[model samples]
Target: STGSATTTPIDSLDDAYITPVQIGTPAQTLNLDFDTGSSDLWVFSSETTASEVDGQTIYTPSKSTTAKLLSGATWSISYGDGSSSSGDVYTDTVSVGGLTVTGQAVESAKKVSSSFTEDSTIDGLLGLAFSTLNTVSPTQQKTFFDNAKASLDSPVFTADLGYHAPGTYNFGFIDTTAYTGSITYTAVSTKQGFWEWTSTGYAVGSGTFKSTSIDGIADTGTTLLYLPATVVSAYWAQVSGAKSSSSVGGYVFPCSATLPSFTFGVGSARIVIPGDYIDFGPISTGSSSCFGGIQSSAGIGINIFGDVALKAAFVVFNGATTPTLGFASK
Candidate 1:
């Protein structure tokens, strides 16, 4: 079986994307962030602290006949940005698009960070990464994608992110028409419990492609493209008036400055991100200084090919025994 879902950006800046999901006997529809970076399908729920629950929709397991408490199962996750969430687990009927999983682990949040509470656009997160990354203790659980892969026509899912528009996440099949040119496939390493792969090299604007092997993960949940410090410095150096700002917490430049496009390699393929995509958004409301979408991953440890890079091409997340990643210009 296969399924397709529309993922809409929460804001004009493409801060995050949310997709509709159904859980329980009488489908409790909630808009969730389909994150490829982490493995945990968690949600704000009836168990969430009243003060912590902002405008997000919550899942009430008691209202679902198919919901069963996992007894001792519990989970906790801390994000790179310091935001975190923790709660108990419940097995329930969960569906995304038209694909269904009978006994899906639905983590109901008992506590959430202020960042999650303030972001009312997303109700929760539906992880698509390797199940090994699941935070559940004692009894680990598989991700929705992992559980549905065996029944799918093809053990693969595709992410087609947009700049400031809605995109799609398709399960079990790849839509050839959704992308341009032939897809370049690369080996993936699940050792880190992520869709980690290496890029041949990168080029700043129209410069020559450096023949360096850079390791990184294709993380849909993240907002920016994080690369090595040298690479980030090369890209920002071309922009006049661009400077690293400790106060603002990243590289920022005059909003009026013309940004340079970024290019990365996947085998023999070259994916070029438009210049405008690199200019993330203003640091402050109506401010002239804007944060860059491409930043150094030096502090982050591992490089991250987040939405800024992913949106430039069509990506296929293959869940085969020997998993592989495919990239195609779109």
Candidate 2:
């Protein structure tokens, strides 16, 4: 049977979309960030020092009858933003939406970085990347989605992210009512354990579509869209008072700037992100100064179509054969 879950965003942060999931027998609920960029299902647990956890709810595997420790297995993960967590491993039944996966590896965090400790709203992460990317030592683990896909009617999942709003993540089946027009398909490379693909090119504002090739990933966990410096520079130039702020560490612009829509090419279709979404909200007080949602991926090596870009369309992450991405307007 197909399953679906709703995601709620955390206010102005727009940093992530949080979903409620259950782990172990009797199903202890946890708010998890469904991340497509990495593979590891971990949570704040009793192992975490009280001082390191804030208002977060800790997962108590010991309280679950089905929880079993993996004697020598351990897991650790670091995010692009420097947030990290590490812990010992346990196997338990995990459920999301209506789909259940048996004996799923659950990383119980013993140590968490300040970034995680402070933002106690997210209890953990549900990684949707390939199983090969799982970080559990001794033997890698399969993600909740990877394990549940076997029982699905089709090996597919859809991400319907919204801007500062609630959205749905559908598994096993596609909901035709969720999107409009035909989905444009593009081949994705899974060698990197990511949904990586090449874009035909992009344009700043209503400018001509450049035919340059840009390789990138569809990452739901990332907050902003990152592109090459040249593209970022071109876009900011269109804004009257935009500048690369060292303090902000990215491009920033006046809230009053009449921004142009940014468009990118899929295989044969063009997906345009509205100009206002490019603002990414305000960065300074009084809300007159805003940060540009697009930035340079120089340090990141590869570009990412994060929530900023993903929210503009309905996305299909196809797992059969070579992974393919289907994007359509919502």
Candidate 3:
């Protein structure tokens, strides 16, 4: 079966891409952050302490007759930004757009960190990452996509992330009209439970394309592009008044600076990221200082081709025996 859903852009156009999801018998609906960086279908639920829920909406398993608690099962997750969530587990029918997956493990949160509790608009997280990354204890849980793949017409999904505009996530098939030019396919590795791949080379703006091998992940959950420190420094140096600051937590530059284009190599395909997109909006009000979307991947383990980079291309996430990535411009 095929399904598609529009993705909502968060405030300031620099946050998680949100989508609507339905769970259980009566289909209690929730707006979830569709994250590719981690795996676990988790939601704020009635089990969550009132103090920990804040103004966010929650799923009430008791309201759905089809919801079955997985005895002795629990899940806890910690994000790269330190956001954490933990809860009991239940099995239920979960659907997105027109696609449905039965007996999917749904983690009902009992506790959430401020990063989550404070976000009233996002009701949950629907992980699109590999099922191997799921955090359920006792037994690992399969993600909705993994559970539904066999029944799909084609075991693939496409992500069309936009800047300040509504995009779409398509399942079971690709929408040819959604992208332009030819889709360049590249082999990817998932040993780390991520859509991990290496860029053949890269260039800052129209500068020399360096043959530097950079291995990283395509993380829809993250907002900025992260690369090696030296590569980041070189990109920022092209812009005046740019510098790395501990207080700002990354490379920042004057908002008025005219930035240069950034390009990443995938096989013979050279994807060029617009200069404007490289400057990931302003870091604060008044728009005096802007943060560089491309930063150092120092402590983050590996590099990440986050939203900033993904937004520049139409991506096909093929869940084949050898997971491959296809990219095209839109």
Candidate 4:
């Protein structure tokens, strides 16, 4: 697979990004999510294993009066999270904003677990990253960017709005005016999985730099912002409110008190995250683990900057460029 020399300009509006590609025919459509964090695309389908996936939206052709499945190819994609899905490999007319691209590679997943069947806001993932890892033969391996890039003005990239935050997930761009003129672009490591970047460091309540000595990669696919054990501890100590436990994932301090803060050094940019952005949800369990920013994980080789970090910056993946990573509000 090949990579872009540099990233091109992107749109910064909400609907232009959120609505994304209105897949299928003009009469029938589905709002699919544009994801640079992943390299696979799968839509909910009637044949999907609804019982297995929770909080996911499963697509069944019957639900749409004009849903047309692709023809000929069969595909299944495996994720690092141990979750996998497969379905028919077919071409469908797809459109993102005013631009229309016909005969795009799309998968109508035949089986999806409960974790995937319940999501209401998002419909499916549109992987706009590189396609180097193909589970199938070289001839059978291909990605959306592989076919879509040649047809676009820019190289291609996706911006995370901040999870369920006001802007949430968006394609291309969110808003150029949202950022100051301080954007620093990095280079991809040539490794697999979104060919990531390195962070300058992460601090807790102006705490000492913890991620500085570690080797980390910036990833959009990762759910939470994971850092060294030392960083996690420092963050918890500074959280606002000081609650005992939390109902959602990660660390918990409290909702009533003003939690501590953190500033992640992404290249030359210093991004500060408020306490409210730290807690995932209400503390239903009294003292369940709820991290303010940093969270501990099983893996050790590399650190990950997940959705928690992406919320603060307008990321530009220069898959269109040689270095691969570029961030700017400029």
Candidate 5:
């Protein structure tokens, strides 16, 4: 079987992409962040402290006849941004688009960081990365994709993230009409439980492609494209009046600056990110300076080809025994 779902940016800056997911037998719907960087399906729930819950939707396990507590199981996770959550676990029916999985482990949050409460639109996160990274203790749980892969026609999923628009996520099959040009396949190492791969090189604007290897993960949940300091600094140098600002927390420049397009090599294919996409909007309301979408990953430890780069091309995550990732221009 195959399934597809539409995901939309939660804000104008494309801060994060969210898709509607149904949990429990009666189908309690919530907007979940489909994150590939982590492996744990957690949500706001009745167990969450009232003080920690804002306007976000909460899941009630007791309301579902099919819900069963995963006795002694618990989970906790901390994101790179310093936000964290921890909760108990239950197995329930989970559905995304038309795809359904029975007895899927659903972590019910007992506590959440202030950042999560501040962002009321995101009710939870559905992790798509390898299950090895799952935070569940006593027994790690599988991700929605991992559990549903057996029933899918093909063990694959594709991400077509958009820029200030709605995009589609396709499961079991790749949509040929969704992309142009041939896809370049590359080996992906799941050693870290991420869709990690290395880029062949990169080029600023239409400059010659540099022969270099940059390792990173394809993370739809992340808002910006984070690369090595050298690469990030080189890209910013091409922009007029661009400078690293400690106050702004990253590279920023005049909102009206003439930005250059960024091109990164995937195998022999080069995916070009529009200059306008890199102009990540004003740092402050009515401010003359704008933050950059491409920032240095020096503090991040690993480079990330987040939404900024993913939206510039079509991405396929093949879940065969020897997993591989494919990139195509669209």
Candidate 6:
């Protein structure tokens, strides 16, 4: 949910709206964090202050039919975006989407961050994605399936992403009825986070970069591809001399020429960039030519593999099944 409940402190909020989750025979709704990037369930509690939980949900031990704190232990955590929050550990009957589970452990933060307080509807995030990055640890610490698999009525936990174009991202019992053919499992990176890959190479316009093809890591978190300027220049130079658009900002190769595609190497498979992203390359007024494929990353890491390339593939994280990364047909 809110990954950092171990080291960092979560501050300020304005209101409180507890999630309705019930586990076991009589499902109930419990307040929990709902985060797509990570998978875990957490909440805020009484040990926390009214100011700390200004707009967060609070658990009243007296009101619960079956609620127990984890020996009053405290926790905190910080994220890549520099955000942090924390709370205590408690176990009780938690319900999600009408599905109930008994003995659900919650990381209740006494002190919460502003980002969380602002999301008034959800006091915390319910992490349903694959990965070990967000879990309420030590004893009873495991994925919803890992801990509740044997007892679930349906034997599967599912995700209902509230704000996507369509459909829900449900998983627990990995239903293959909606997918096509067999799953194309990608090799897991064992890093315990999102599966990243190496770039086989990139192309700006059409020019040849020092290495037109090199291994690269693709991340959805990153919005744009960041190839080296040298490499970017080589490609943009070849593509209609890398012309820039006045209004949009990024490069748009005459909107005529069939631009060179960016290729990323995923161990054995290769992912190609689509036309929309390539056509909308770099959109900055910083230099001789800067397209989307290669923007200014003076101090950032090497070229990244972003959604510009991933949208075309079917990806999956095996957090519920195992500590492995897997992929299936779209």
The prediction achieving the highest lDDT against the true structure is 1
lDDT of 3: 0.89
Candidate 2 lDDT over 179-282, as tens digits, reads 88999989899999998988899988889999888999999999899999999898889899999999888898998888888988887788889887787768
Q: Candidate 6, 47: how far from true, in Å?
A: 5.6
lDDT of 4 by residue, 88-191 (tens): 75456555544555666667777754444544445566665567653332245456666656655565544535434344332344345656676676667656
* 3 versus 4: better lDDT goes to: 3
* lDDT tens digits by residue: candidate 6, 1-330: 110111111211111112344432333344453343444566655666676566555565546667777784555666434556776776677655434456666666667677656655555655543436654545435545445555543333332111112223333445556444554444444354444434445433332432334434434333455555565555566666555455654444553555666554444444445444454322344433334443433345445544444444444445434444333334
Give the Cα lDDT of each candidate: 0.95, 0.89, 0.89, 0.55, 0.94, 0.47
Q: Count the backbone clashes (under 3 Å) in each candidate.
A: 0, 0, 0, 52, 0, 69
lDDT of 5 by residue, 1-330 (tens): 888999999998889999999999799999999998898999999999999999999999999999999999999999988999999999999988898999899999999999999999999999999999999999999999999999999999999998789999988999999999988999999999999999999999988899899999999878899999999999999988899999879999889898899999898889999988888888999999999999999988999999999999899999999999999999
Per-model C-alpha RMSD? 0.7, 1.3, 1.2, 6.2, 0.8, 9.0
Candidate 2, superposed: residue stretches over 4 Å from native: none
Which residue pairs show collisions in model 2? none
In model 1, residue pairs whose N, Cα or C atoms come closer than 3 Å (at least 3 residues apart or on different chains), thus clashing, are: none
Measured on C-alpha atoms, candidate 4 has an lDDT of 0.55
TM-score, per-candidate, Cα-based: 0.99, 0.97, 0.97, 0.75, 0.98, 0.56
- Tell me the tens digit of each residue's lDDT in model 3 across 43-137: 99999988888787789999999999999999999999999999999999998999998899999999999988888888989888898999999
Ordered from best to worst lDDT, the candidate numbers read 1, 5, 3, 2, 4, 6
Which runs in model 3 stand beyond 4 Å of their true positions?
none
lDDT of 2: 0.89
Worst 10 residues of 5 by lDDT: 275-284
Query: How close to the true structure is residue 237 of candidate 2, measured as C-alpha lDDT?
Result: 91
In TM-score terms, candidate 5 sits at 0.98
